[PDB]
Each structure stands twice: as structure tokens, then as C-alpha cells.
Symmetry: D2
Subunit: 20 residues, 4 copies
Amino acid sequence: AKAAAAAIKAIAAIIKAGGF
Amino acid sequence: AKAAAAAIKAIAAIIKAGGF
Amino acid sequence: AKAAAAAIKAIAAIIKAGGF
Amino acid sequence: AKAAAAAIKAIAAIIKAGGF
């Protein structure tokens, strides 16, 4: 999870666009 | 769920590096 | 994305609790 | 990201079930 900010900050923003 | 490749590519490829 | 509502609806709520 | 191992150790396996 050292990588987690980098992974998640894409997906939660893409989520807000997608409407999952 | 139209977004559910595109969002996931932006984590699963980073997971591959991170080792979450 | 058969799995999407099972992945996302956990993880975005877990995010809401975490602060990733 | 304190939540992130316990999030994604589900979600990566749910991805491996889905095929996202």
C-alpha cells in the first residue's frame, strides 16, 4: 500500500465520473 | 459500469507494482 | 463487471472510512 | 491507506473472479 495513493486517487476520481 | 475497465486498469496495473 | 457492484460498493465505502 | 491491504486483499481477488 505504499502505492495506494497513486492507485486509488485515479479510481475514486474515475468512480465519481462513472457512477459505479 | 461503462467505466469498469478504464477505472480498474488504473489500479490493477498499479497493484501489479505495489503488491497490495 | 459482473463483479463490479461487489468490488466497488465495498471499496468506495471502505475508502470513505479510510482516506486512501 | 491504513485500510488498503484489508480493502484490496478482497478487491484484487474479486478482480481475479470478475476479469475487469
